């Protein structure tokens, strides 16, 4: 009758973990193989701050070949999740250079939740030992990116260890409702 339906579109570079995060959100576990390029999702009656909502999750591919389809998905969106990987400075720079400009262009004033993915790798000593320090985005650098591009919230998460997965989508709801 009145339950709000929220269209939330997740975007960001190839291989940052957008699909794993959508899958992890409903299944509460890390999908370790057979990951499709896109897996749309939904959760019903999600209660955030006592308010109940249907959250529709549109997955999008980061692939360059699908760049003309993406704006078709942006149409009618209530909120975007804009993802980059915490162990990829390149993905972080693409947020500034590629993703935020496109969202601003096709969907001005739609709130953006910035999300840094793969938090487990940022905290993994072998991973850190074997990659340049400059590749790694620290929380202060993510929060700065949030202000710089004008996103409304910033969440760091790991699908692999289930850190802050629920917070990503609870934040997506809050930003639409508050
Ligand atoms: N260590 C770690 N790996 C992750 C995490 N999430 C995703 N991955 C790994 O990251 C790779 C890409 O994940 P995927 O969800 O397919 O990324 P995507 O952003 O949907 N890629 P596309 O843009 O091509 O659809 C996979 O190898 C996957 O296991 C995470 O939290 N931690
Ligand atoms: Mg995907």
UniProtKB/Swiss-Prot annotation:
Keywords of the record: Apoptosis, Cytoplasm, GTP-binding, Lipoprotein, Membrane, Nucleotide-binding, Palmitate, Plant defense
Residues annotated as binding GTP: 12-20, 37, 59-63, 117-120, 159-160
One record GO biological process: regulation of actin cytoskeleton organization
Top-level taxon in the UniProt lineage: Eukaryota
Motif (Effector region): 34-42
Processing and modification events after translation: May be palmitoylated.
UniProt subcellular location: Cytoplasm; Membrane
Keyword Membrane: yes
Major subcellular site: cytoplasm
Membrane topology: Peripheral membrane protein
Gene Ontology cellular component terms for the protein in this record: cell projection; cytoplasmic vesicle; cytoskeleton; plasma membrane
GO molecular function: enzyme binding; GTP binding; GTPase activity; protein kinase binding
Keyword Protein transport applies: no
Subunit structure and binding partners: May interact with MPK1/MAPK6. Binds to RBOHB, preferentially in the GTP-bound form. Interacts with CCR1 in a GTP-dependent manner.
Family affiliation: Belongs to the small GTPase superfamily. Rho family.
Protein role: Small GTPase playing a general role in disease resistance signaling pathway. Acts downstream of heterotrimeric G protein alpha subunit. Regulates cell death and reactive oxygen species production, probably through NADPH oxidase. Also involved in sphingolipid elicitor (SE)-dependent defense signaling. Activates phytoalexin production and alters defense-related genes. Down-regulates metallothionein 2b, a reactive oxygen scavenger. May control lignin synthesis through regulation of both NADPH oxidase and CCR1 activities during defense responses.
Identification of the protein by name: Rac-like GTP-binding protein 1
Lineage of source species: Eukaryota, Viridiplantae, Streptophyta, Embryophyta, Tracheophyta
């Amino acid at each position: 009758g009145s339950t709000r339906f929220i269209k939330c579109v997740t975007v960001g570079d190839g291989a940052v973990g957008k699909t794993c995060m959508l899958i992890c959100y409903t299944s509460n576990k890390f999908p370790t193989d057979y990951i499709p390029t896109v897996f749309d999702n939904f959760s019903a009656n999600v209660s955030v701050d006592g308010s109940v909502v249907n959250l529709g999750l549109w997955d999008t591919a980061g692939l360059e070949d699908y760049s003309r389809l993406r704006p078709l998905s942006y149409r009618g969106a209530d909120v975007f999740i804009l993802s980059f990987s915490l162990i990829s400075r390149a993905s972080y720079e693409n947020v500034q250079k590629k993703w935020m400009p496109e969202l601003r262009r096709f969907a001005p004033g739609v709130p953006v939740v910035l999300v840094g993915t793969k938090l487990d790798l940022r905290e993994d000593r072998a991973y850190l030992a074997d990659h340049p320090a400059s590749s790694i985005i620290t929380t202060e650098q993510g929060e700065e990116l949030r202000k710089l591009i004008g996103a409304v919230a910033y969440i760091e998460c790991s699908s692999k260890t289930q850190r802050n997965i629920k917070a990503v989508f609870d934040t997506a709801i809050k930003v639409v409702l508050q």
